Enzyme design. Structure first.
Site, short mmCIF file in Angstrom:
data_model
loop_
_atom_site.label_atom_id
_atom_site.label_comp_id
_atom_site.label_asym_id
_atom_site.label_seq_id
_atom_site.Cartn_x
_atom_site.Cartn_y
_atom_site.Cartn_z
N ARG A 119 40.69 -21.79 -36.95
CA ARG A 119 40.20 -22.90 -37.00
C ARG A 119 40.92 -24.13 -38.45
NH1 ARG A 119 36.65 -25.34 -32.37
NH2 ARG A 119 37.03 -23.71 -30.84
N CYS A 173 41.68 -28.01 -40.02
CA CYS A 173 42.50 -29.85 -39.66
C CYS A 173 42.55 -30.25 -40.91
CB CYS A 173 41.13 -30.54 -39.20
SG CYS A 173 39.98 -29.81 -37.77
#
Lengths: 108, 124, 124, 107
Positions: free
Chosen positions: C101, C103
């Site tokens: 992941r 962001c």
């Protein structure tokens, strides 16, 4: 496919309050939250994780006002371990589900 | 990557399975590269990303929103190495408007699918 | 984008101010382009990013972790267009291993910092 | 300093339990949580937002077991309107602070 392991971390899909036989439990949000956790125990075990190794939980809820009730049950399964992070999100859920929970857990 | 299958739990729901509007905000369900005939775009990831965006355009329009009003996108991807290709398509939809936040996450996606995207947008 | 300031509240922090380990996960502080002398780095975004990555190695090794155990990265950036330039330096350090992941978020950073990164990593 | 506005959304920076003059608030975690909410109130007003336009709150906390008392104060400011999303995260906070909160809000 109830989730995925990626370098030592299990990312679960969302568990909804169905029995493994595949129908919705009868009862309030607290009972639904029991079934969900019961479902999560099972997928955690299969992945080689457990509740102790949960690092994050995302609760999807039909109604934010029922959070206290879901949280009473969260604190029963997470009494001796508290995931470092949790989120609560208003969501539209499959017919009759008031709660759905996903987790992220270390593979022991 | 490895999948987790058990018979002592029911099948799971992809958490963003249905769109919702709360407090002037549209949170889309995750859009996969399905066509109106309900079959997957089984092409390369750039083709699949185009189809995802076409499905995103529809759900946005339906929710009284648009690409212009998207504040966050989350890209679920089968293989993180394929991000660069997905992002080349992303940048065509979000060209002069760029969502203030995005995330990319490795996921196990419905059979075929290499990419899935959900967005959060202001309702006009 | 527009900055917000009021005398009627104190200065904010930026919540990833200091690192922590809980349940075998290292949650790093946000790392900016300060040098070991304390100087903010004199360069374009790529130069600054390299300095971020050196500061990251340090905090990761010190916590019993490594780039290869990073499970999530968050890139804070003043303009989302500059992401590609950050991402070139990201791909160097996350060559063989890619965090499952990541962001990217628009944010106002400390003076001269055009990039800030925090990571979450497994302490085996 | 205290946040940014992008595309009609206000993204606050984290507010800690400081008074406006810059002293740490003295009292339990509830009293700290009130101070943080007064500070957020002031930052939201400045941004042209309000508690009612808050779409997400993030609570950074020194320990999970004190969420109970944080949440009781959260429930006071978000009574008629609850943000659609909130997160609670264990964090290392600036000294003396047991709680820190940031919000995302429509302008």
């Amino acid at each position: 496919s109830q989730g995925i392991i990626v370098n030592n971390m299990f990312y679960s899909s969302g568990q909804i309050p169905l029995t493994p036989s595949g129908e919705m439990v009868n009862g309030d949000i607290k009972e639904q939250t029991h079934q969900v956790f019961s479902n999560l125990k099972a997928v955690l075990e299969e992945a080689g994780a457990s509740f102790e190794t949960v690092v994050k939980a995302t609760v999807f809820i039909a109604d934010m006002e029922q959070f206290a009730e879901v949280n009473e049950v969260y604190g029963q399964y997470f009494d001796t371990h508290k995931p470092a992070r949790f989120c609560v999100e208003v969501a539209r859920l499959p017919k009759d589900a008031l709660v759905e929970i996903e987790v992220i857990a270390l593979v022991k």
